[PDB]
Write a protein that binds this ligand. Structure first.
Ligand SMILES: CO[C@H]1CC[C@@H](n2c([C@@H]3CCCC(=O)N3c3cc(C(F)(F)F)cc(C(F)(F)F)c3)nc3cc(-c4c(C)noc4C)ccc32)CC1
Length: 115
């Protein structure tokens, strides 16, 4: 099954917008983690494939997903990086869990319609 870029934009970008709309939880995910700004030089020792909302949005805008599961996988890469690097008590970690709950609800009917 071949998916057109605008078909993927129209279907998937609302699920990404739902994540952006989460306040306070989306704020640290709207731009790439910057270990220099944050003073965490070990970040890229632990996270080998960084991901964030702005990168996912650019990939969707530029047709880099051929197939909707590739988009789902990048969203979960974002989540898994945050749960891997951050402490269980940290805001980023708890905010990530909220973003995953929101994403689960938004993506479910969308994937069904893309099938
Ligand atoms: C240019 O915009 C800015 C640049 C950077 C800022 N940034 C902060 C700042 C640093 C100062 C202390 C503080 O408290 N920060 C802070 C913490 C939060 C928290 F989410 F923890 F509540 C929210 C905010 C904000 F966005 F409201 F401003 C700032 N720490 C971050 C952690 C991550 C992260 C992830 C994901 N994975 O691993 C990590 C690590 C990513 C971004 C972060 C967010 C926005």
């Amino acid at each position: 099954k071949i998916f057109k870029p605008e078909e993927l934009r129209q279907a998937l970008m609302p699920t990404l917008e739902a994540l952006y709309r989460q306040d306070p939880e989306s704020l640290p995910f709207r731009q790439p983690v910057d270990p220099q700004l944050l003073g965490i030089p070990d970040y890229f020792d632990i996270v080998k494939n960084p991901m964030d909302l702005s990168t996912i949005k650019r990939k969707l805008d530029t047709g880099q997903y051929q197939e909707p599961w590739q988009y789902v996988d990048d969203v979960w890469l974002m989540f898994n990086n945050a749960w891997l690097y951050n402490r269980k008590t940290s805001r980023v970690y708890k905010f990530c869990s909220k973003l995953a709950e929101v994403f689960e609800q938004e993506i479910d009917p969308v994937m069904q319609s893309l099938g």
